[PDB]
Amino acid sequence: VLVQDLLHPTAASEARKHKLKTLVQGPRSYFLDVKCPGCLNITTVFSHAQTAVTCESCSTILCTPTGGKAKLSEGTSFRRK
Amino acid sequence: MRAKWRKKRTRRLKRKRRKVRARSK
Amino acid sequence: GWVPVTKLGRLVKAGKITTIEEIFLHSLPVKEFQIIDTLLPGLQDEVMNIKPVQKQTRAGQRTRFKAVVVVGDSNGHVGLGIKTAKEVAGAIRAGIIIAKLSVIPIRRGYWGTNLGQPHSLATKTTGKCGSVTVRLIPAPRGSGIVASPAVKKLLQLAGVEDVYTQSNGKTRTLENTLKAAFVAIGNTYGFLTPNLWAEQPLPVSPLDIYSDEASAQ
Amino acid sequence: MENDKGQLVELYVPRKCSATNRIIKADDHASVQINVAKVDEEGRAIPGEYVTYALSGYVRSRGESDDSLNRLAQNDGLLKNVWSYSR
Amino acid sequence: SLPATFDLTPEDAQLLLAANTHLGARNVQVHQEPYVFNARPDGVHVINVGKTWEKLVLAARIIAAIPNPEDVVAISSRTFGQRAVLKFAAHTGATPIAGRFTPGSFTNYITRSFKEPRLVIVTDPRSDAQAIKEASYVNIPVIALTDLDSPSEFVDVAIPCNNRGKHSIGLIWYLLAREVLRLRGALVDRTQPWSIMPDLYFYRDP
Amino acid sequence: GKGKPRGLNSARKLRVHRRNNRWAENNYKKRLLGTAFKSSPFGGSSHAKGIVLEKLGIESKQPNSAIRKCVRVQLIKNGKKVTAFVPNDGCLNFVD
Amino acid sequence: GRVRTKTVKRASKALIERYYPKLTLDFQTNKRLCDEIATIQSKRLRNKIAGYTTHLMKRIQKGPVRGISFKLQEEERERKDQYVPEVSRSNGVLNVDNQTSDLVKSLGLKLPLSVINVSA
Amino acid sequence: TRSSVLADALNAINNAEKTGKRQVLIRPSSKVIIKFLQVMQKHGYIGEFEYIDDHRSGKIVVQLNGRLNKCGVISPRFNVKIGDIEKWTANLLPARQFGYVILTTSAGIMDHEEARRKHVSGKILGFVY
Amino acid sequence: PKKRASNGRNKKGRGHVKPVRCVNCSKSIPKDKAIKRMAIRNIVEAAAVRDLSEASVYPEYALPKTYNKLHYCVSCAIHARIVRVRSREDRKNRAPP
RNA sequence: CGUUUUCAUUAAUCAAGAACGAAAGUUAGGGGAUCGAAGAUGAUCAGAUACCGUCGUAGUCUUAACCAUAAACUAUGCCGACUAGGGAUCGGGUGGUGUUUUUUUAAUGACCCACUCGGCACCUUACGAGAAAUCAAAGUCUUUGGGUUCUGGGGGGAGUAU
């Protein structure tokens, strides 16, 4: 206060701010590839999906939408990429 | 006097002056 | 004999502080009036006003007198004291004392030529007291003081030669007008003009160089 | 403040606050001047020799004088810790 | 600018950690305190004691820069700090005010309690608020032994401490006295355990 | 901006607004409604000549308990009856 | 009401503050000491001051009275706040938390450690 | 809505300078803020500033040195004839010896001194002292 | 001028609160403005409990209570209950006792 | 609120104009328990066309339509930016080798801790404002300019006459 670096803010002070109120605004959401262990291929599901994304071959479910982040449906395996 | 009882009295004045002026249209 | 207390009075009385630039520089609080009767002895006073204020009492009134007094010599210092007492002579005496305790300095400058011996204010300045706003504008040479008589006398004792004045609010109340103008002349040493941009090495207080000569027995 | 022939007029060039570079007035009685002792080898600090700062009344009244003294003492070398620039 | 040997010695760290100087105040936290270090779960905010020691050496450098040792005023109204400031006044010059502050002591001379100092050290900026408010009328630097929830207005250099105390208050006063007795003093080298016992500064009895 | 437009193309709002607000002035109202020529028993002129009808003694209300000696005058250019004070110690012995 | 004024109380206070030996607990002897060591311009005021000195003796002799110190009280409190018991680390090691251990590891040196696991 | 972006920038700078700060992050960041701050940098009133580029309107962080008393915007950019510069500088500057009335002319954004030297006039933007 | 920042009482964010009636005079006062105290008292007073618990089968059996919430107006609460009149600085307090 | 969805200046404030607008009131049915302008009564009182007691019409309620006023109050236009410290709370979200609910680990909900937007507010200061009361806006104003709408100009007469 009265002297601080507003150009190089600390990462812990930046990981807590709103995604619009950081220094350069950027999304806190991500993508992740999911494989259901019945099939073999993987599909890329958004973290905040909003749709019932079913698998490509067996159309069952991978994520049911919610208020914020999507919920992966308890038989899954996901990697953030 | 209280301002709404002067307001009520004024409405009773205007209701009379509308009546006497209606007799001479 | 004076026999001072409040160590700055002893640095003044032993002669270790000679000018009020040493007090006005280090922002030292002045508690005794003889500190400026010795460091500013050619100071002249002026009683600006005497008015009766009154208090209602369970049988009658209590009328005491309120005196507005301005001191200040002719060379950049003024002070303004206001005091009620039960008697007018005691009120004027105590107003001279409070005006001597409150001596402020004045940054006077030029209208816009750098010629000899400054005559006017360096900046446009403004003081508010109560509702009275008194604004002082720098003026060309030979303007005189374009002001009301009490403001003109407060700026005359200041040593200001040329100034323009505007005022706003109930300027008939003499206390608030004189105090607004006193703020407007004390605020000339707060405006950071670009000739004061050069850094200074922050001198040591005179209370430490003459630490031995203070701190009485 | 000078005049046509070189000469300084306007008595008392004022002091300035080390935390804000603002003019410390004559009627500023919350302003303060802090002398910090210079220390030689194995202590025993060098009497009559200080590093001095001045802080205005506004810096102290806002509660900023501690972080300002941390900053002003760190980048003189009195402290090699407390004040961190990225807040 | 510290030569070699003003570092936080491990014995001083054992003293400061034994007398609980790091156990700061709870979730209450003034924004003017970056002396915190990674708040312990169930409330308590651990104070960085290295920062405490650095501010302590700085404060002892400020105290040992006054020409006279006796226009320093140690202030305590809280009973945890009264014996502390009394033994601080015993060893150094440093005139004490233990207990009632008696306003008017700084401004407006002629009272019998008229101290006119160049430094005021205050054990608690909240319970000694009138001394701090009154020192800002008369241009005095104020040092304060502050916990993390204590107000910072009109204090310059502060020592982050635990003024809930009964151990930290007398210890930080003891360390100020020991450190200002090292600087410009009749004292000894690096190790120098200072035979004057640490716990002479503490609240006695109840 | 607090109450008024400021943009460069807004002089019509400023003109019409001040022209509307001028009517609250007493002087402007009485100078542009022609009070002087219709009301105000002269013609708006400075002096006016008239003929004395009767002499009146007007009692001063509240303070200054006295009988101010006045006359009732009918103006020549209007015919308007007007009470006019006759100032000095005496001077009702001079008007008839 | 037998409330005694500030004359009686301040003179009694000042008599104890400089004559605490000589000033026993008996009224009839303090009545003579206030005749010897003080100059009181009346007999009634002398008896009142002597009675209040005897009263304050009676409540000094069961512990202190706030306000009055003579020589022996301040000498005793002077030789009471010089205390032995000290404190230590002699009772084992320095018991810390996880975070105090992070603190000393982040700044200092090898000090004895014993971490804890307190939670909400 | 946001009607002027210089006005928001200069009020942010004024509040941070009144409150003793040494840094202002200004939300709006136009070209005219860049040239206004360049003139204020040329006459010493601000330190360096740094334009941070997100892929949007942009931000600026200005360093302050305490020399600024007030910077201000004149909100309708009034068409100033070269005889009216003395009227403006008499109106809204503290003295004739310092402070600049900043105005955008077709020969660039500049202070009134360079405007007098280059004999150019135009519209007024603001003022710095 | 304003005598309270919360003018009568406790309406910030509504515009209208439904009124209740004073229990004493039946003056209709808004529910947030009223003055509200819950009277919680036994059906026996502190003298009668001995002679009543003597006079009972099922030993002492409940000491059963009585509950009602009293809404007063500003007039009739001042005239008896919660009044005195607080000074301008003691007005701002909100601790009950 | 969430969002790495879309369009790409579509926006802000607004004479004239329009929708909605407590209570009372009006028109025509329905309903009419309660309270209750008017009215009738019993006391009080010097009188009592009042307060207090009893009875009770219109009204209170509803349907269709008027009326367009309230101390319609936060007596504080709306949009935008900046400036200060705190802890509560409501709605959304993110995090936790945290508690609870056992079935055996889970899972959800409730809670706890930290953060975050968006609300109704509050508390302490005052940098600042103010004639003061007081005000995180009533600040960022004689160092006066972010955009815009409405209103005022001594008290009456008078919100009267037309």
Author numbering:
A (entry chain Bc): 2 to 82
B (entry chain Ap): 1 to 25
C (entry chain BD): 34 to 250
D (entry chain BW): 1 to 87
E (entry chain BB): 2 to 207
F (entry chain BY): 2 to 97
G (entry chain BS): 2 to 89, 95 to 126
H (entry chain BX): 2 to 130
Question: What did the published study say regarding this structure?
Answer:
Using a combination of ribosome profiling, yeast genetics, molecular biology and cryo-EM, we show that S. cerevisiae New1 is a yeast translational factor involved in translation termination/recycling and its loss leads to ribosome queuing at C-terminal lysine and arginine residues that precede stop codons. Taken together, our findings demonstrate that New1 can, although with low efficiency, perform the essential molecular function of eEF3 in protein synthesis. Here we demonstrate that New1 binds to ribosomes and plays a role in facilitating translation termination and/or ribosome recycling at stop codons preceded by a codon for the positively charged amino acids lysine or arginine.
Therefore, for solving the structure of New1 locked on the 80S ribosome, we used the EQ2 mutant and ATP instead of using the wild-type protein and AMP-PNP. To determine the binding site of New1 on the ribosome, we incubated S. cerevisiae 80S ribosomes with New1ΔQ/N-EQ2 variant in the presence of ATP, and subjected the assembled New1-ΔQ/N-EQ2-80S complex (hereafter referred to as the New1–80S complex) to single particle cryo-EM. Further local 3D classification of class 1 and the subsequent refinement of the defined New1–80S particles (class 2 containing 48 757 particles) yielded a final reconstruction of the New1–80S complex, with an average resolution of 3.28 Å. Extra density was also observed for two molecules of ATP bound within each of the active sites of the ABC1 and ABC2 domains of New1. The ABC1 and ABC2 nucleotide binding domains (NBDs) were observed in a closed conformation, analogous to the closed conformations adopted in the 70S-bound ABCF protein VmlR from B. subtilis and archaeal 40S–ABCE1 complex, and distinct from the open conformation observed for the free state of ABCE1 (58).
